[PDB]
Structures are given as structure tokens and as C-alpha cells.
Amino acid sequence: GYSFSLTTFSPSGKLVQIEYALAAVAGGAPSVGIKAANGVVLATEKKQKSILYDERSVHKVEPITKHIGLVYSGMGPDYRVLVHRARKLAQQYYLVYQEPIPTAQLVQRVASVMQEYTQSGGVRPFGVSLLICGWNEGRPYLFQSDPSGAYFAWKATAMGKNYVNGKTFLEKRYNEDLELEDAIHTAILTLKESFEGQMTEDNIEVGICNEAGFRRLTPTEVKDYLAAIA
Amino acid sequence: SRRYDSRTTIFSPEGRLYQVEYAMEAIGHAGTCLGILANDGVLLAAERRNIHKLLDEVFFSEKIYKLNEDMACSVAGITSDANVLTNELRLIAQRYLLQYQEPIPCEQLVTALCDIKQAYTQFGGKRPFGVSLLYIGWDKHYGFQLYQSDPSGNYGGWKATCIGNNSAAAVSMLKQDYKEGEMTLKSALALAIKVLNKTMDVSKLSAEKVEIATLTRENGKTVIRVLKQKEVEQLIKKHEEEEAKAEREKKEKEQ
Amino acid sequence: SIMSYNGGAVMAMKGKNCVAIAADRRFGIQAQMVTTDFQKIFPMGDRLYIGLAGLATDVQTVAQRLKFRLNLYELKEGRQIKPYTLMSMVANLLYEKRFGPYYTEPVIAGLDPKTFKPFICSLDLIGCPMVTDDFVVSGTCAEQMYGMCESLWEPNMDPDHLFETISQAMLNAVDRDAVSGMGVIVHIIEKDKITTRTLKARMD
Amino acid sequence: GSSAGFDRHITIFSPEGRLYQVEYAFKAINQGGLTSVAVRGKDCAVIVTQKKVPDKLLDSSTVTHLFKITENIGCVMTGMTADSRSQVQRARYEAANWKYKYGYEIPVDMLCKRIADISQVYTQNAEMRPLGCCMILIGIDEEQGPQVYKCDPAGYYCGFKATAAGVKQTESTSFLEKKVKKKFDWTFEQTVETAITCLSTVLSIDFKPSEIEVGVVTVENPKFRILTEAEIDAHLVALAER
Amino acid sequence: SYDRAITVFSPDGHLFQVEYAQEAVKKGSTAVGVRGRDIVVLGVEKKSVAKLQDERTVRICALDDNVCMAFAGLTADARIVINRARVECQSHRLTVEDPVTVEYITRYIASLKQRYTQSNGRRPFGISALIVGFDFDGTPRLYQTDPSGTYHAWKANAIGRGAKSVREFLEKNYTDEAIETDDLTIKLVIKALLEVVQSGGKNIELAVMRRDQKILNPEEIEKYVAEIEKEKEENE
Amino acid sequence: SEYDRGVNTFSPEGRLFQVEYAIEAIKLGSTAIGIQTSEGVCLAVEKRITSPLMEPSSIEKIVEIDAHIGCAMSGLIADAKTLIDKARVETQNHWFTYNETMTVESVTQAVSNLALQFGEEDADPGAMSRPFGVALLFGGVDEKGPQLFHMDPSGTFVQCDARAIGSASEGAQSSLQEVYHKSMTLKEAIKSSLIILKQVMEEKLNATNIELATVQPGQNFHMFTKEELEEVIKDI
Amino acid sequence: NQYDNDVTVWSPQGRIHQIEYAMEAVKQGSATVGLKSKTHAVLVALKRAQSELAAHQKKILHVDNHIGISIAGLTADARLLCNFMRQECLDSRFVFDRPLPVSRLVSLIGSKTQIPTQRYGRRPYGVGLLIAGYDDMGPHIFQTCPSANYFDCRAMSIGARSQSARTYLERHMSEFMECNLNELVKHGLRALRETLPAEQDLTTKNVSIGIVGKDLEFTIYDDDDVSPFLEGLEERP
Amino acid sequence: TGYDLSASTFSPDGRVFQVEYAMKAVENSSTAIGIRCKDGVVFGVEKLVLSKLYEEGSNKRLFNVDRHVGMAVAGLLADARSLADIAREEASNFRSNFGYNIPLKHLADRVAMYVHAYTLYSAVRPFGCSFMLGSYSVNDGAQLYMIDPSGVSYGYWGCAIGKARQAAKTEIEKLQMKEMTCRDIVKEVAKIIYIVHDEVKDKAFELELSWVGELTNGRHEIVPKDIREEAEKYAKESLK
């Protein structure tokens, strides 16, 4: 292997490989996350190129534990690597402390993993950003982790293509007293703001966290919500 | 392999370590952190770069980290590198407590971290850590202490100092207004608000843009406290009242 | 037996909104007494305590390593540890040395840092947790303590009656064991105060 | 299409967030001049590949891109031949180890996921290059039916109703899209007919039994089967009499 | 691990990295050492920030009870080298049961620096050192080490910025009269430092070492500086 | 650029670049002369003293390998310390195992084995990154009599009758050609070497700026004291 | 040039320039000749050093009672290879109580030398070898090149200006098989003389000889020992 | 641009140029030929003699990899020898683990994978050799495989490697080799070798012949001298 760093400092003080990874993130499919009073909603666009694609095969919304869920923007293979790492970390925490891991702890450990790839030898950063949802201590959590290894806590946020417009939309439409159904409607509206074509239950993917846990919505439920929106 | 090697740990023809200088440039652009040492306490004051309306409050602080029962730090630069370094600082302190069964002195912790940071400038072919740190603490040998460290592995003890954006102007103001040996925590908080007022020129001073942490001794225990937004708003109101009074007395002289 | 080399007895008891933890004070090498103020109960929180019985070197080693791990946990998490989580942490520490065991048996007594619910548990040589609603004992005089505790314990005791019960149990149990005794110390843990008492005991 | 540094020589990011070496690895698949089509049906999965023997001095048995991973999983490889063989060996090892560790036969989707995970490492570590090969897997899952999966050098894997790989992939994709939109739940004969017709139409070649290879899997016989020349000729004469 | 060759030869027979480390030394603070009859004198230039520096835990460092060191160059490198030297001094006390000789510790430090000019994955130390001390037989000793591993013994020397000028001054002013008493040697050191250090004597730290045993506070340094200005005026 | 080539790269003419550059570093050092006679071996070197403040007694260009073997060094003197320690350890291990003294040729061969052991990869941690910038002259007495050997950074060692190494080697070698005969006495050899050294040195030869050592059959390794040096210098 | 600095880089012509540069080291070195009769094997070496005081550098080395080698190029690489060969022969005697066959030794050398030519940051061995040996199959002369290629020769010369020696040997090679020892050695000496500039001649100082045979351990004749052979050698044309 | 300096670099059009340069190294070598008939395999090499000082049997290009398996190489001889040792070790390990003689297809696959492992990294260089493996057994019959510097292994009826490969292939296609015997094949191999040799550029050469079949009891060996000299007579007659 190569023992030297591929990410170095520029004369202006920038780590330019991290910025190019962020450029990879900004070209990906849009993702939205909203924190309601009783839950969290993560929504993404999976617009396949052809009818030949079997929609039940690959999922962009993934469970990490019973109460933690993940979504991404950027490069998919890197996302799979990070999902495997996160699931292993949660299992190690459970084996040591006999408790399901808090969301913030998972975010911190995964962000450490992402930082390692900005300084290790012979590797590039991860070209993916992550939205993390959880329910701990009777309270919902939403976090964002970027290629550098930095994590932020959000009430609502958007990632991917047209994320600035999504941010303004969410600013205008977000409220503290939102309940989860209103949040789901708002998330689908944010995705509609930047969508080409007809939004069906098969080209978007939604997941929700509440007191019962994290679950991925079936296409039937998404069709019901889409009929409500339209 | 030789073709792709960036050669981070070598000398320039002028004796300079270029990656360290570039990391110093990175620190010059981060959020401001000032530390002020008093007779009864020590304080850290940072500016918050996470000021979006859709951001959520959780945890304890954004830039202030608690390393021990008696020590705390504030970081400027790359945040992920800061997370790495603070984890390592906590580990060093707990290893000392295991070995000697006493709390670690502050300068020993700073020296250990600075040895780690010097290692990255001399061998390994990896990039340095782009983070400067301010440390505040209390130990039984020297009392209340304030230290600074930079990516080269250099550290120094200070009575008042600033790192980050516009730190030279802040240091000039501190040199002008710091009173040696006659400083209380209250007057230190006033001075911190004044310096942060002149350093945060891009946007004027509101409580949601600053965080203040205090270290004091009470009944033989060390207390580290992050000020609530109420107290910071009180401090800013006091600053504005004092400034208005000074302006009025300035307009008083001619009549 | 390598456990009986130094002796020692620890006991934990459950009340109504309170917990009590008691220990003996002797430090000795087999039959010889060395000191009469040996610490066997350590604070792991404001309302959480751990008592260790067994080989005194392992007692001190385990206490110090446990404080290492607990301090790191509380710095990383920004919270105070729950008693069940501490039980799991201790069990993990003890089972990491499965084939080179620490010769200590712990009891944990505390109140939950939010709902203030009593918790007591015991762990054996390698870390099998035992959670009980009445009492737990550990040491060289375990059978004696078992008899006293089975005879005296009642549900829903107030702090004063809990103190009387645990004090009588410990005193009368250690009076029948040769390598345990030389004083008893009791901690009564409530929501609003910790009460530490030293008992008038036999010094023979 | 900007660049800065060694971003065209190693797997690092370009200013636009692209990995040029992965795109060049995709270009490598088209070197070889072959095309493959995989089609899924009601109870069957079929892979049809182009077979070219330039030399009469070549032993035609050894020129094959259809491989057997387990008794029930089959694959067709497209691209650089040595890289393809390397990936086939890796897949066989992984399936055998799954059977040893977990006690049941590996699902097709999990095998594709493992292969794509291995491929991702080559796009993150700079001392190795990607493999210039595409893998198509077919199998029968006793809960979901026929399965057709594809993995590429980037680390992407997906499951398909029908797919193609190679030089003429875009035209074959268009043909199959039209055929799938007019949906008929395909019988075994209809599936084989569809695959062979796609290959013929896109290549503009009337096939001789020796110019193609066909590999099938069915619910009734779940074992991966390679068709002999007689069976292929039966299918071809049926296609002509249409 | 990182196994690149950093220090290599150039076409003219030069080790460029060593020369660049010598440039780094040339950028550092000025240190002057004078060897006396009974004392050894070590003076350094201070970079002082007005009112804001805390100089309570800062010391010119001690390797043992009997050896002192002054450095010029990269301060973090100097800290590393000092800690290694201290560990070696304790090992020598353990293994030989006698205190170190000044030359022994100088040899250890020079060999460490040379090792870093010929190892894979490492750059040279950017520090030059002056080492002063007393042997068991009570002879005063002063040694200098270079980033390349070259160590010599000197009567008077200077390292750091403007060390060439200070060395010319010492060459013209180091005579046997000037070493007769402690005050004359301290005046020689202070004059040499004043050659290149400007602003005055508040930028000067002075340490004096005596047999089987001293830091000059600012007021005594000012006393000596006033005496020097007097003796200079009496030339006219 | 400096890092286009590796350290183990051949030139189009068939020579390792780093070795050629190190041999060029040899030309920058002080002049050492060695003469072999039937009565013993003479080694003379010049101390290159840069300042009057330097104590010439800390310059060791001639060392004792064993009671029968001595070495004179030219070039990058700090690099020579590793080789000398290896030589001393080899001679003592030989005495431990075989209860006899080593031959000069065996010592030279053992030291020459280290010369090309440099590289970047496929080498153990603690391996060398560059060649050695020293030339060595070994002089000793064994059962074959008085032996003088020359070693250069390439690893090549030869046996010589008279030999000069360092900056002034070519002219000194010509003079040695003129004055050497097989029937010389050790006193004549000492005088001739000092005459040549005086000829090539840029300073004036006195008893403090040179070193002389001899090895004779029966007498051990001898470093000339200042008084014996003055006795010899009087004749020149 | 971007193709001439590493041993791992192929040129567009299909060559590795570092190996050719390493062969240049053998071409620069001093010349050696080797020849075999039906009973003996002879190595003749032209010793030289930098100056007259500097004794002529050692070119013929002793490997085993039945094997000796001559050197051209980098002497330290030659000593590395010599130590490797000595250890291999010793291991053969330890395990099988018999001498190692010469062909198997040359195979082991070729295996050792090829590895560095395939790995990054390594270099070839800049040494050319001539191996003289005797075993159950008779006398053998072998040549080793830095490219890791080895040859079984009837006769061979390597070094500087060795083409003239090779020409002489080709002209006279049919005689060698039927010669006695002195005649064979004189043939080798004449071939070696063919490389010297026209003024230089063969003296007892600049010539080393190495002989192995049916009933003779490998012997190195240097100095007075070579006077018996240099006797009766006609002047050059 | 430097798209051709490492084996871990693709060119914009999808080519690894270092492997292609290794193939160029193979094309400069002298020609080796292998012909397979129902009962065996015959190998023929044109071995150029670069000087008359070289013995007969110097620089052999035909190797015994196993008692039933033979190898014919072209390109860089040192790389070929290292590969021969790799193949020998593979065969030995197979016999020690599974207890019988390795099948030729399996051996070819293993060696081809070892060769392919050198086409992926910047730390190693591709092999500059191509080779043919030939074998006979009663169960498997007669097998002839060829492996190139990229790691591709294919089975053949007739194969040629080196400088005159195309002309040799043209000559091999004129034989109905399936219904021929090994004795006829030796004479035809010698004839083809003598046809493709260029006397003007290449001076002189030896003919190296070997075979494996039921005639040899599944043992790979050098063709006996009388058969070789008879075949050489036939070849020289055919050239007029």
C-alpha cells in the first residue's frame, strides 16, 4: 500500500480533496430529513434510468438498529461501506453496555471513521454525506455527517441536487409543532420542488422513526401519502 | 509511489516546513477563541460558526470540551481533527490518573499532546493536524493556568490570548486593556465582551453567536460552567449601556 | 482458597426509595491484622456505589480500572451512568480476564439518576450478573450473611429501619467469621442525602 | 471536464467530484468486442452471449464466458478475460465460504453485494486499479423466484428484469425496454426467443448454433445448465419459422 | 510504514536536507556560551510579549544535576531531544552508578541527530545545541552539536541568528584577562549578546553555573549593562 | 528535481548515482596519509581548525579499533562513527569466539559489507537510506606483518603500500609515488608523510593542527603526543 | 526519459533500460577469460588497481573445493553472491554429504538475481560472473549476466575489450579439449593478452590464475606461483 | 502523458500499456511451436546460437514442469525460469494435498492467475514471457494450453509463440493433425521450424524437440537423437 497522505494542505489552507468529495456529494440525488415532535422522516429520490430495473433490490434508506436509520447523498458503494461500519459499531456498543446505542454516539463513531480517510495513507475521502435519524430518551434526533468527518444536528435539512432551494423551502415551511404526518407531507413537497417527471411510489423512498422504531415505508403507504399530496 | 508522494515532512530551501505553515493559514480563518486569566478564575470565549436557523441545540457546547475534572479546551481549525485530538487528551489524562491516582497537571497534558503533534511534522509522511488549542485549568502546583498550542507542537503559557479570525487585533486590544494582577472574573467577562465585539466585525454581537465558559474553585472542587444565554444577554446589555455612557461623556466635553 | 487470603464482607440491601451498602474494615495477611480502615466501597457517581470483596490487590486494581472506564464514558456521553449499564461494564471487564481471573466479587448499589429507583446487583468471579429485589452479599462469610438477611429483610422499609436491619445483619454475620470484621461501615443512599455511619463492633 | 494533479492516473477526486480511472475501466469492458444479454421470466432465467473463435487452431471448448459459480448460480463475464477469471475465482471462493459458515446456499443478491464490495476497495485505494470486467449472475431464490443481477467495476450492483452488457449495450437496452413494456409473463421458450432475438437484431447477424452460448436456470430444474448445440439449433429453427 | 529516503546525496556531494536544517538553525534565537575558570556562562535572547506571557513554569534546561543545554532552531525538536537525553542520563546513573560526563551526553545527542540524517521516513532535527557542565575532576566544559551530528569542544561559541558576527566579536575579545573573574566573563557574554540583540538588556536571559551547584534576574543584568556602558564611555 | 530517481538507480554509464555523489563528498574532506613499512604503519591526518576558539583536542580523525588496528577517516566524519563501532564489536567478538586477534583484512571486509546495505523498500526498519560519505584507511599488524588497507563508499577495499585520501589526494599521491621505496624505515616514513602534509595544508603545520599514529610489531597502537610531534616537526 | 529510472517500467520497445545500464557495469570492468579441457578448468584474470602502491584488486575468489568464480563489475555485489554460493554449497554438504552440482548452483544464482528485477525500488546485481567447476559430469565454465541469464560455455571472456579475447578463443577452441594443463593455461593467457593495449605486457603482478580439475582442489596461483606458467610465452605479434 | 508508466493505470481508452509493452517483449523472441494429435503433444523450438563459444544445451527453452507436463517458453528467459519454478511448485503442492497428478487445465489456470497478479499493481512489473504447457494422460487425453503476459490461458490444437507466429500458424493450418501420429508430427514440426527461420537476419540455430503421449507412457521427454536427425534431414530436403 501507499504510506503517505493523498489529502494535503494547500497554500490557502484548504484540504482540496475534501472539497472535491463535497462536489461529488452535491451532484447526487436529493435527500430530505425533517424532525417532527413525535418522529423523524427521511426521504430520498431513486429515479432509475429504465423500466428494466427491479425496484425491490437495492434500498437507499437503511436500518442500523431498531431505532436508528440512515440515508445518503453521493456515491453508493461508499455508502454501503459506511453502513457496514455503522452496523458493526452499534453491535460492539451493545455487546459492551447491554443497551442500544444512542444516536449521537453512533454519529460520533461514524464521523471518526470518515475522518480517518482524510489523513491515512493511500486513500481518498468518502464521496458521500449521511443523514442519521434516531429515537433516544423519548426524544427524536437528526444528524448530518459530511466527508470531512464533521457532524451537525438539524431540525430539518436537505442534501444533494438543488439543496440550497430545498433549504429555503424548509425554512419557509418548518414548524416546531409539526406532527409526523405533516412532516411526511412536507418532505414529499420538498422532493417535488426538484423533481423531473411524475413522482410515483417507486421512484421515491421514505423512512420514519417514532417510539416504535425505525421502519421503511412500503410502496402502498407511499401511494396513500402521494394521493394525499396531489 | 515516488511519483505520487507529496513529501509533507521535509524542509524547504529556507528551512521552512510548508505543510505546517499552510495549516497555520487554515487556523487563521476559523472562529475566534479568547482566553482570559483572573485572580479567582479563568474563562474561554468562542464565536459560533453554526448560526443557521434550522440548526438544533443538543450536547453541552460546540467548541468547548471538558478534558478532565479540572481542565477544559477550545479548538480552532478543522473540527474532525479537533475531535481526534480531544479524544486523545482525555485518554492521556485518564492514563495519568490510573498511574499516579492524582489528577494530571495542566502543562503535562499540553506537553503530551504537543509531542504527538510534533511527531506528525517529523516522520510518517502524513499531513499535520490543522488545529490550535486553548487550555484552561487548575492544579495544586501553579493554580489557575491558560495555555496555547499550535500545529507545530509549540505551546505557551499566557495571561490572556486569542486564536482564530482577527486574533492580532484582539491581542492588541488585550495588551491595551489587561490589568496584571488586578483582574476578577467579572472584569474579565467585561473585557471578553469588548474584545469579541471588535473582533466579530462581520456581524454584530448577539448571544447566539458566542459561548462563554468559566472555571472556578468552590469548596475545594473545580467548577466548569457554560454560561446560559440569559447571562450572556445580560453581559451584552451591560456593554451597550457602558458604550452609550462613554459616547455621552465624549459629547459632554465641548459644552 | 485465594479469596480467603485477605477476607472481607460486603452486603447491599434494598428499601423503599433507598439503598444501603455495608462493608467490613479489616485488612490482614491471612491470620495477621495489618490495618483496620481498609476501603472496600467506592463511589461511581453521586447515588451509585460499588463494593468489592476478595483479594485486596485485585480490589484496588478493579476499582481503578473501573474508574478509568467510567470517567471516559461520562466524558464521551455527557450523562451520568445508569446502574444497569455499570453492571454490564463491570461484567465485560471481568470476562475479558476469563482465563486469568481477577479474584474479586462486586456488589453494586444505587439509585437511577433520573427516576430514583433502587438498584442492587451482584457479580461472581467471572461476571454473571444477579439482579435482586431484596439483598445481595459477597465475601468469606456469605452463608452467615444469607441466614441473617433471609431472617430479617422486609419489603418497603424506610431508611431508618433499613439501617437497623443491615447493621444487625452485618454485625452478627461477621461476629461468626474469623477473617472478617474489625468494624463495619454503612452507606444509606437516598434521593437527597448520603449518610455514612461507622458501627460499634468487636475488635477481636 | 477539469483536472488537477494525478486525478487521471490514480483513483482520487477531480474538481467536479469524478473518478476518471473508474470511467476508463468502464471503457475497458468494450475492449473485446462481445455482447451479452440476460432475461428473466416467470420461472426461468437465461443468459445468451456472443461466441467468437477467430482461429480454427483454437479448441472451442475452452473459449467460454459462461461460468458455473455453484450448482445453482451461473454467470456471464464481459470484458478483459484475465480480470474476468479472477473475479470468477473470487466469487466461487465466497459462495463456498458462505456455505461453510452459515450452513445454507448463498443468495444471488448477497453474492453480487460481496463482489461489488470487493470492487469498491479498488476505487478507494490508490495502489491498485479496477478490474475491466462486468459480471451478470442468474439464479433461483426459493422465496422470490428467478434472479438476474449485475455488477460493474465502479462497485454498483443491481437486480434487473432484463439487461445487457458489452459493445452494443445501449441498443439492446432499448430493444428490451420495448419488449418489457408490452408485458407478457414469459415462458421458457419465450424468454430464450426474446434473448436470442435481441442479440440477433442488435448485432445484425443470423446465428449459427456455434456463434452463441446459452445458459439457463429454471424453477423445476434449479441447476445451472449450459445448452448443447442441438438444443440451440432447435430454438433457432423455431425462431426462423416465425 | 513510511520508508521513503529523505536525506539523499546531491550531484556536488551535498546533503540538501542537512543544509536546510542549518538554515532553520540560522533563523532561531541567539545563544552564547563562554567557558570560565570556575564558572560557565550561558546567555540567550528572549522573544517577550508585553505583559501577556506567563513565565512561571518556564526555565536553558537541565539534563541532570550537572549538565545544562541551550538550543537554537525548532523548539519542539529541542524538547524531543532534551527528553531523550534525560532518559539516557538516568540510564547511565543506573548502569554505571556514577554521574554522566558532559562529553558522554554530547556524544549521545550527536549520534541521535546523525541517525536522523540516515534513516528512512525521517527528516533531520532543525536544532543546534550548546552543552555546558563540569566533570568530576572539576574542569569546565562547553560543547556544540550541529544538525548533521558534528560535535566539537569550544572555549567560547555562539549559535543562532547573527552567530557569525558574535563569533567574530568573541574571536577579537576572548583573552585570558577577560576570564580572570566571574564579572569579567559575564560582561563578555553580555557584550557579545548586545552585538546582535538590540532594544537592550531586557531581551537577555543569563545563567551562571558553578562547581557542585544560578539565574540572573533583570535588575542585576541591568547593573551589568550599566557597568558595560560606563567602561565603553571611559574609552573616550 | 531531487526525487525523480531512487537511491538504487543506475546511470547510463553503469554506476550507482548515490555512490558517485558520495565519492564526490569524499573530495571535500581533510587529507589523510598512510605509509606501510616493514617496521610498521604510519597514519597522519590534518585537523581542519576553523576558529581559534575551537579546542583541537576534540577533533578525533584517528581512532583505535584494537590494540593492533587503527583507523584514519576522511569526509563526513559523523557517518564514520557507525562503521568504527561495528569494527570494534567485530574484533571483540572474534577474540571472544576464537581467542585470537583479527586480521586487518577481515576487519576491513566486515566494515565494507555495510557499505552498499542501503535502500528504501524491502529493507528492515532501521535500515540505511543513503551511502556513507567516508573514506577509511586501516593500519595494523598481524601475522602477515604491517598491513594498510583503503576503503571507499562503494564497498571496494584494496591493500596499499602508500595512500592519500581527502581533498589534496592527487598531489599528495604523486609525492608519495616519488618518495616511497620498499626499504623505508618508520622514521623516514613519518618524516616523508609530514613533509607531504606540510606541502598540501593551507595552514602552517604545527604540533596542534595534525595527528600522527603508528602501529609497530610488538608495540601497540600509539598516538603521538605533542612533545613527540614537536620532536619530529623540528626536522621538517 | 520516463522509462529509464525504474526496473519495473517497460519501454514501448519492450526493453528494461535499468538492466542494460547494469550490463554496462560489467562492460566497464577488467577482463577475465575462462576455458575448459576434458579434464581441467582454468580462469585467467587481469588484476589491476588505481595506482602502483594500490595492490591489484582481487578478481578470483574461492567458493568451494570444486568451484571458483571470477568477477567483473561491482565488487560488493560480487561478495554478496559469493557468500550466497558458499552457503548453498555448505548446506548441500550438511544435508546430503555430497558436493553441490555446478549447474544447480548456477540455477540458484539465476533465481536469486531475477527477483530484484521485478520489484519496485530494487536494482539488478551489477556483476558479471565466470564460474569454473568440476563435478561428476566433468569440468564446467558458466557465465552469469546482470539480467539473471546464465550460459554454459566452452570458453568465455567478459570485461573491457573482451571481444578480441573472444575472437582469439573462437579461432583456437578446437584445440582446447585435447590440451594438457600448461598448454590450456597458456591459451588462456594469450587470449587475455589480446585485450591489453599494444604497449602493455603480461607480468607476474597483473595476472591471476585459478585451476580446478579431476584431482586438484580449486587453486589460486598469484605472484611467484604464476611464473611457471608465464614462462615460455612468445612475444605478441 | 504518463498513462503508460504503471500497471495500475488505465489509459483514457481502456488499455494497460505496460502489459502491451511486455507483449512486445515476447514478439522479439525466436519462435516456439506446439502441435497436438489424438495421442500426444510435440514441442519445437528454434534456438538461436549467439556465439560458437556456447555449448549444446545452453539456454534451454523446453522445461519439465511435471513428469507428465512440459513447457515451451518465449520472451525473457529469466522470467520464464521463475514461472517454470512456480508451475513446478504448484504441481508438487497439488500432489501433496490431493494425492494424484495435477490436471493440465487446473495447472494452467493456477499459473495464469499467478501471472495476472502482476498486472494490477505499481509495485511489480508484468512478465515478459509467453509459454505453452503440454500433457498426456489416459483419462484426460492430450492437452495443449497457452498463456500470455496478461494471464489469458486458452486450449489449442496448434500454437505458435514469438517472432514468426503468423507464418507458423499459416503452416500449421495446412495439417489435419487430429488423424496424425506423433512420429509424423515431429517431422512436420521440424519442417515448419526450418520454413519460418530467416537466415539473413538470424545466423544459426538448433532445433529443440520434445513430446508427451502414449508413445512415451505419459512422460515428457526430449525426442531421441535418431528421430531428431531424421526429422532434420526431412526438413532440409523440403527446403531444397
Author numbering:
A (entry chain B): 5 to 234
B (entry chain C): 2 to 256
C (entry chain J): 2 to 205
D (entry chain A): 4 to 245
E (entry chain D): 2 to 60, 62 to 215, 218 to 240
F (entry chain E): 6 to 241
G (entry chain F): 4 to 240
H (entry chain G): 6 to 245
Original paper wording:
The inner two rings harbour six catalytically active subunits (β1, β2 and β5) that possess N-terminal threonine residues critical for their enzymatic function.
Marizomib (MZB), also known as salinosporamide A, is a natural γ-lactam-β-lactone compound derived from Salinispora tropica and is a potent 20S proteasome covalent inhibitor with demonstrated anticancer properties. Here, we present the cryo-EM structure of the human 20S proteasome in complex with MZB at 2.55 Å resolution. As expected, the atomic model obtained for the h20S proteasome in complex with MZB closely resembles the characteristic architecture commonly shared amongst 20S proteasomes and displays C2 symmetry, with the two sets of 14 subunits arranged in the conventional ring configuration of α1–α7, β1–β7/β1–β7, α1–α7. Similarly, the orientation of the inhibitor is consistent across all three catalytic sites with the cyclohexenyl moiety occupying the so-called S1 pocket. Intriguingly, the increased number of coordination sites for MZB in the active site of the β5 subunit correlates well with the higher potency of the inhibitor to this subunit.
